[PDB]
Design a protein around this ligand. Structure first.
Ligand code: U1E
Ligand code: CL
Ligand code: CL
Length: 330
């Protein structure tokens, strides 16, 4: 089998991407944030504290003839950005772009943190990291990809995120028309539950490529590109007027600037992020200071190849017996 669904930026800045997902019988369509950096499929629901729902579409398990409460099961998650959610668990039928898993764990939120409430466009998350990170207790549950993998034509999914435009998540096949050149595959460590790989280096604009190993995760659920302080300093040093701002929380630059591209290495291959992809607009409404899309990971403990990086590439999440990651230009 295969599945294919269109993913769309939630706003003008590509802060996140949402993909329609069908849950239950009859189908309830919710727009979920596909997150290769986590492993829980959780949704706003008829059980979510009413004060914490503000425009999201909710899953109502009582209206699904295939929903079954998973007895005694609870979940609770906290994300790197400080947001949080928790609740109980059902199993139900879940379909993405024509691909169906029966008995998928659907984590129904009883509580969400303020940032989730404040984002009316995201009805929940669909985690696509490794199931070892799933938070359901006392019996850990599998991700949608893990449950679907054996049925797929090929045990892979692909992320093809658009810049200010729609894109595609495919399951079970590689669309050879969706990229230029070849796909370069690179090793993955699953030891921390992430799609963790080692970039071979970077360049800033037309500058000399620096060969250096950068360990990081491919995370579609993180907006920005978080890299070591030395690398980020070298990038922003090329932007007239750019500075690290303690009050704003990262590197900012004059909105009148044209940004240089950023290249990262994948083996011997190179992925070029256009400079415009690094502009995240005014720091506050009407400001002429703009927020940078490349920021330091120093306060994280891991580098994060988030949407800024991933949207510049066609990305293969290869769930073969030994997982690997593939990147192609596009
Ligand atoms: C541009 N923008 C909205 C931002 C401005 C100031 C600080 C930010 C910190 C993290 C993430 C942001 N996003 C891009 C959503 C920030
Ligand atoms: Cl199917
Ligand atoms: Cl190299």
């Amino acid at each position: 089998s295969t599945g294919s669904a269109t993913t769309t930026p939630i706003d003008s800045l590509d802060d996140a991407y949402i993909t329609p997902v069908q849950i239950g019988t009859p189908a309830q369509t919710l727009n979920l944030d596909f997150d290769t950096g986590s492993s829980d499929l959780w949704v706003f629901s008829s059980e979510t504290t009413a004060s914490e729902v503000d425009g999201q579409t909710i899953y109502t398990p009582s209206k699904s003839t295939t929903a079954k409460l998973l007895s005694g099961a609870t979940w609770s998650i906290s994300y790197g950005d400080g947001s949080s959610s928790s609740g109980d668990v059902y199993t139900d039928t879940v379909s993405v772009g024509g691909l169906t898993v029966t008995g998928q764990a659907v984590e129904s939120a009883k509580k969400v943190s303020s940032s989730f409430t404040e984002d009316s466009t995201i009805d929940g998350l669909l985690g696509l990291a490794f199931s070892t990170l799933n938070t359901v207790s006392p019996t850990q549950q599998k991700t949608f990809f893990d449950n679907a993998k054996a049925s797929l034509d090929s045990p892979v999914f692909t992320a093809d995120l658009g810049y200010h435009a729609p894109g595609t998540y495919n399951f079970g096949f590689i669309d050879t028309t969706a990229y230029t050149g070849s796909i370069t595959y690179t090793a993955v460590s699953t030891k921390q539950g992430f799609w963790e790989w080692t970039s071979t280096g970077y360049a800033v604009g037309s500058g000399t490529f620096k060969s250096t190993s950068i360990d990081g995760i491919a995370d579609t659920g993180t907006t920005l590109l978080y890299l070591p302080a030395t690398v980020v300093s070298a990038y922003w040093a090329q932007v007239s007027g750019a500075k690290s701002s303690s009050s704003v929380g990262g590197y900012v630059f004059p909105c009148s600037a044209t940004l240089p591209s950023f290249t990262f290495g994948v083996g011997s291959a190179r992925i070029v992020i256009p400079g415009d992809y690094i502009d995240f607009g005014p720091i506050s409404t009407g400001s002429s200071s703009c927020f940078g899309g490349i920021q330091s990971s120093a306060g994280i403990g891991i580098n994060i190849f988030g949407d800024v990086a991933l949207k510049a590439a066609f990305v293969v999440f290869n769930g073969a017996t030994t997982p690997t990651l593939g990147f192609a230009s596009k």
